[PDB]
Design a protein around this ligand. Structure first.
Ligand SMILES: [Mg+2]
Lengths: 201, 116, 349, 238
């Protein structure tokens, strides 16, 4: 068998150069509010977020106006609070801005979160930080804001199949068979996701 | 052919000449072509009626349950066929299509009553 | 309060005396090789500065540190070394510039240090600079401090000495800043200033909508600022003492002038504030009559009452200084560990 | 927002002050003639110096030159290159530049008082151990490979001249000038590698110590260079 070396050499060199001089956070997050197109990509923005990108600002721009980017300060998911009335927030624990940014308007930061007043015991990370959809809540109006408070039949064919099965078995079992649904954790769309799973250019 | 990632998916394969489709529900990878290779030929469907008028379809219940327990996603037309069968829940888009057709038919009958 | 203002310990405690040019060259090399650097270098630099252009070098290197791989630290004692180095050598233009573009430099003074700064402003007797600076403190959102009395003095004096009829930016800045000092729940002055701030915010909403209320200002989104004002006045009339000032007349003027004859953020079921204006004004007249039926002198000038605040001001200055000395000594305790931490590198070398 | 202003101040006292420097073409040649000729050509080149700046440089400095040529795109010609030597005296004084581009080595001889040259610029200012660097022809091309797009390396206004103490590798022996001899008194080349102990011992045959030990041939310059300083200051202030 003939081995090949230049292929692995090029793989190594490309990985090294990528990790070395990949485009920067702010560089690839920048947007021109007039044309609504990200530089380095030439892609247009979605119509639903055109207005948000025109009017509203970004999370790090909100956080740059207060010391230490406001550890423990009240920032809420505007999308969550428009999709539902209940309060939802982010117990931001760690923060790191990008040094190449001029206004320090980009970076990575996260901590514990809460959905519908349901806290979790893990400092898991944010979802969609770089959007123009972020709203900061002051230290006043905090407690009033953070205040918060069977089964289904089977399909007809499936239940008929089970009826015939247990009739062949010999037990009548007059009860209609059902499954559990309170166990099923049907989660809303907007429950966040992990960043390490999704890649980056 | 080892595909990058992908997943098992039961979907429709097309057979027969033009203007005579014959669908085949069959398990395969997400990345395979339409009539590409498969794993197990599960069931069939004919969208045209027979001499009696019936439209035929065959489903392999135990094997389909085995494949779902192993893990395989469903395509919208085949899961719609399953919902029509009743082994599977009915489709919300089908409900909406029926409701829209009924709204349109009521509107047309109203327009006809206005014209007459 | 010269004792509260000046302090010889800070200027005669732990001075380094390294070469300014050598520290400049070191920082330049480190920031040209763009590797991260500790705050010890900047601290020693600032402690060694004794000149105007040296403070300017510090400004440039602080900009570089903001744009350096690590800037979140921003140690309070380092920024206070900088603040002293600036204000003792009298660079008020530079101080104000940094403080206004904090996002460009990221200075974040604590309560006692900022109170020293504003006392120096009092001594030099300037008004517009202190006004802009208290707007920047409103941006900071730091008011759980004994400097709350100074902020109240400043705002209550400058809103009266303003002499500016129409200015939307400045009027929103006021209507937003007048709330935070009064949140300490102290007296008529406190909650009536809260009420007047609610009125100002409602006016700003009615005149330019709710967008600017929250876009570049951290505020709450409930459009019923007039409803909240009515609620406050109602609970006050129901309940203590109410030493009142005639800014209720300004509130009346605003309400009447607004009652006088694109993205939709408002909800459909909820009415339009334009159509609430009438019942707003009717309930406002109602609460006015209720208050005058229920304290109603309306002659005690609000800024004149802030000199009576100077007594408990001098009282709380005690624990203010105490906490300041605590912070100084604990800085000195935990900081010496970092000096030997830098010596660890030379020991390993 | 406006951008901040860069500021740097390093004030080590006995480093900043450098005193004077003369060009190698104001001084005349050993030959005999009336100093009136020198005075006239000097005042002419100074009346031209009032216009043209000729930024100070040395051999081994990288210079960029723009010249007005009658036939060219825009009738202007740009050229960047390493300075190999400064030759001639008076108005005819020239400097040589060299650069390898597209694998091929070009050299120019610029007259620094011609009017068709538009301006001079010092991208880098250095001094080599060898006063004349014509051995770069036989040297490897990578030593003379300098890019045109490189911007000027800004130097402090008053500092000593940087001298890069280095050595150079060379093409194999089939040369043109036979650089190994001692009459050239050059050191940048690496003949320890480029040739053998036997060949260097054979080359030291031509060693002539009486050249440098002799004392009647050299040319004392203090007098005439002082006079030149005087005349330069006079014509400048006038
Ligand atoms: Mg030859």
């Amino acid at each position: 068998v003939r081995p090949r070396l230049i292929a692995e050499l090029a793989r190594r060199v490309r990985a090294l150069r990528e990790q070395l001089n990949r485009p920067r956070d702010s560089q690839l997050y920048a947007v021109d509010y007039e044309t609504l197109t990200r530089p380095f990509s030439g892609r247009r923005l979605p119509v639903r977020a055109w207005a948000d990108v025109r009017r509203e600002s970004r999370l790090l721009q909100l956080l740059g106006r207060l010391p230490l980017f406001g550890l423990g300060r009240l920032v809420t998911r505007k999308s969550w609070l428009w999709q539902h009335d209940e309060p939802c927030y982010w117990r931001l624990t760690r923060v790191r801005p990008d040094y190449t940014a001029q206004n320090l308007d980009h970076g990575k930061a996260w901590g514990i979160l809460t959905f519908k007043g349901k806290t979790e015991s893990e400092a898991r990370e944010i979802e969609h930080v770089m959007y123009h959809d972020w709203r900061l809540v002051p230290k006043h109006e905090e407690e009033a804001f953070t205040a918060f408070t069977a089964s289904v039949p089977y399909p007809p064919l499936l239940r008929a199949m089970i009826i015939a099965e247990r009739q062949k078995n010999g037990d009548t079992s007059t009860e209609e068979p059902m499954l559990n649904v309170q166990r099923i954790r049907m989660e809303p769309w907007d429950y966040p996701a992990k960043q390490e799973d999704k890649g980056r250019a | 052919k080892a595909y990058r990632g992908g997943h098992l998916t039961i979907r429709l394969a097309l057979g027969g000449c033009t203007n005579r489709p014959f669908y085949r529900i069959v398990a395969a990878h997400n990345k395979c072509p339409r009539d590409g290779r498969f794993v197990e030929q599960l069931g069939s469907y004919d969208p045209l009626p027979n001499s009696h008028g019936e439209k035929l379809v065959a489903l392999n219940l135990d094997r389909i349950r085995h494949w779902i327990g192993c893990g395989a996603h469903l395509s919208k037309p085949m899961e719609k066929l399953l919902g029509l069968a009743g082994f599977f829940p009915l489709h919300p888009m089908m409900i909406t299509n029926a409701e829209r057709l009924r709204r349109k038919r009521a509107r047309e009958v109203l327009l006809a009553s206005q014209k007459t | 309060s010269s004792a509260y203002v000046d302090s010889h310990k800070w200027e005669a405690r732990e001075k380094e005396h390294y070469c300014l040019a050598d520290l400049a060259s070191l920082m330049d090399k480190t920031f040209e090789r763009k590797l991260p650097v500790s705050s010890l270098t900047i601290s020693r630099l600032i402690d060694n500065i004794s000149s105007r252009e040296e403070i300017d070098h510090a400004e440039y290197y602080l900009y570089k540190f903001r744009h350096s791989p690590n800037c979140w630290y921003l140690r309070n004692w380092t920024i206070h070394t900088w603040i002293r180095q600036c204000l003792k050598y009298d660079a008020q233009d530079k101080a104000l510039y940094t403080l206004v573009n904090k996002v460009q430099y990221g200075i974040f003074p604590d309560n006692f240090t900022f109170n020293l700064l504003m006392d120096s402003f009092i001594k030099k007797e300037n008004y517009k600079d202190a006004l802009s600076v208290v707007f920047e403190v409103m941006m900071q959102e730091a008011f759980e401090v004994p400097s709350t009395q100074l902020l109240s003095l400043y705002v209550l004096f400058h809103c009266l000495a303003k002499k500016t009829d129409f200015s939307w930016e400045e009027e929103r800045n006021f209507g937003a800043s007048l709330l935070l000092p009064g949140l300490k729940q102290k007296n008529s002055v406190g909650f009536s200033s809260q009420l007047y701030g609610y009125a100002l915010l409602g006016k700003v909403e009615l005149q330019q909508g709710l967008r600017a209320v929250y876009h570049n200002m951290p505020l709450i989104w409930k459009p019923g600022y007039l409803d909240r004002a009515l609620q406050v006045m109602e609970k006050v009339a129901a309940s203590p003492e109410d030493i009142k000032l005639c800014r209720e007349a300004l509130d009346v003027l605003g309400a009447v002038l607004k009652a006088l004859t694109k993205l939709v953020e408002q909800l459909d079921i909820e009415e339009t504030e334009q159509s609430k204006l009438p019942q707003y004004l009717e309930r406002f007249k109602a609460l006015h009559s209720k208050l005058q039926a229920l304290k109603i002198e309306s002659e005690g000038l609000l800024s004149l009452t802030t000199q009576l605040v100077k007594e408990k001001l001098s009282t709380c200055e005690a624990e203010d200084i105490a906490t300041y000395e605590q912070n100084l000594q604990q800085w000195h305790l935990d900081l010496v560990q970092l000096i030997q931490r830098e010596q660890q590198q030379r020991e390993q070398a | 927002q406006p951008p901040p202003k860069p500021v740097i101040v390093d004030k080590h006292r006995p480093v900043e002050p450098e005193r004077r420097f003369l060009s190698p073409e104001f001084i005349p040649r050993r030959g005999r003639t009336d100093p009136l000729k020198f005075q006239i050509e000097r005042k002419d080149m100074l009346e031209r110096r009032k216009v043209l700046h000729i930024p100070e440089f040395y051999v081994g400095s990288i210079l960029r030159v723009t010249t007005a040529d009658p036939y060219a795109s825009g009738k202007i010609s740009q050229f960047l290159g390493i300075c190999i030597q400064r030759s001639g005296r008076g108005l005819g004084a020239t400097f040589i530049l060299r650069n390898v581009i597209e694998g091929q080595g070009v050299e120019i001889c610029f007259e620094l008082y011609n009017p068709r040259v538009q301006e001079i610029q010092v991208v880098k200012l250095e001094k080599r151990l060898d006063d004349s660097l014509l051995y770069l022809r036989d040297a490897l091309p990578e030593y003379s490979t300098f890019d045109v797009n490189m911007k000027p390396v800004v130097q402090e206004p008053n500092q000593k001249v940087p001298v890069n103490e280095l050595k150079v590798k060379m093409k194999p022996k089939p040369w043109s000038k036979r650089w190994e001899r001692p009459n050239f008194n050059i050191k940048g080349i690496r003949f320890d590698l480029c040739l053998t102990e036997q060949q260097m011992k054979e080359a030291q045959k031509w060693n002539q110590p009486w050249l440098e030990f002799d004392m009647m041939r050299e040319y004392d310059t203090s007098k005439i260079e002082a006079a030149i300083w005087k005349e330069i200051e006079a014509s400048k202030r006038s």
